[PDB]
Symmetry: D2
Subunit: 116 residues, 4 copies
């Protein structure tokens, strides 16, 4: 699994479940092409977005729909979404774990990059 995303809720102290996210890859013309999408599980994780063969070198963007998540909980949050834009596999193939911690007016994102 080359790309995994984990989302946590800092208000409830729990995984952020059923959070939608969309992954895009930058094309040669500088436009964002849809690449993959899914929703976090009961553990706040989203696995299986891509495969080693499909996840080629490039610039990727993960847009996490945090606004719909907070709205479902009765909160009007500050951000429209939480994101990560990064270059993947430019110095060889890697496994990427993107972790996001959510609050109504704040978010943090971190990456764990390991050699397969």
């Amino acid at each position: 699994c080359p790309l995994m995303v984990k989302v946590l809720d800092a208000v409830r102290g729990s995984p952020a479940i059923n959070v939608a996210m969309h992954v895009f890859r930058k094309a040669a013309d500088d436009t964002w092409e849809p690449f993959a999408s899914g929703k976090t599980s009961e553990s706040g994780e989203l696995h299986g977005l891509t495969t080693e063969e499909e996840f080629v070198e490039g610039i990727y963007k993960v847009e996490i729909d945090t606004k719909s998540y907070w709205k479902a909980l009765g909160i009007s949050p500050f951000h429209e979404h939480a994101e990560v834009v990064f270059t993947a596999n430019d110095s060889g193939p890697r496994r990427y774990t993107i972790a996001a911690l959510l609050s109504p007016y704040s978010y943090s994102t971190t990456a764990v990059v390991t050699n397969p």
Copy 2:
């Protein structure tokens, strides 16, 4: 000053100086329109991006060039940039302070909204 951005460096424990950022506003046609830009001062702050008259309700994006910042320091970063996308809403008088804390492989952002 209705919009202020402050950027901190979690590696050096200091303000993040000379960090470039661009602000965009989403137009009725769903496109991002350039709105303002600048670079952080010696205090890690960027003031004067907009005025009360110009800063109307809408969806705004602040793209912070974190990658060039880390490259200038000789540190290999993860993110291409740090985005902050938010709706500006009139609900009494409001001023927005966007604070970003930067690390090579992580960033955090918060908003302080005051009256």
Copy 3:
């Protein structure tokens, strides 16, 4: 002002007002000695904790009463408090700003050390 503490609320997007905190200094016998204390202002800041003459090198602890803050807001928190333990070191003139960002189940702290 050699030591300043700023506290922000990530749920309300505002300064964290009337937050109590106690500062301790580790003495030669390994015990924690009370050093200073106060409550954050309407701007979420606590200034005037110490002076340049009093703030010598040593190991200091700032215990922020986050639990009472969340309880006052009717939100069930995780942490009893947020500690910040650090060494103050003379390496040219220095001023310390401790910034804490609070959520019910999480907190972040950073230091901005300037000359």
Copy 4:
């Protein structure tokens, strides 16, 4: 496993490996009694600190030796340690995952609390 700790390094984008930590429990006289300790694995995790029978209600403190971690990497960090002080199992038994993200001048801690 009622208590698990995960530590990440925000400078290298990796798990924080071989990080020492000590867990204390507050006694009736308000003093901190040593409870458990260990070091994070190659995955930045520390499992098996306690058992369901031993992990009774109380106030606990996890002190993570972040200073020795940064010093081993050639960095003189700001904090002496990263910590979490919390009341455990006061409203029934729970499983606690403490996550810490480390930078030389900053740290973040979050808890994921789930019902067994």
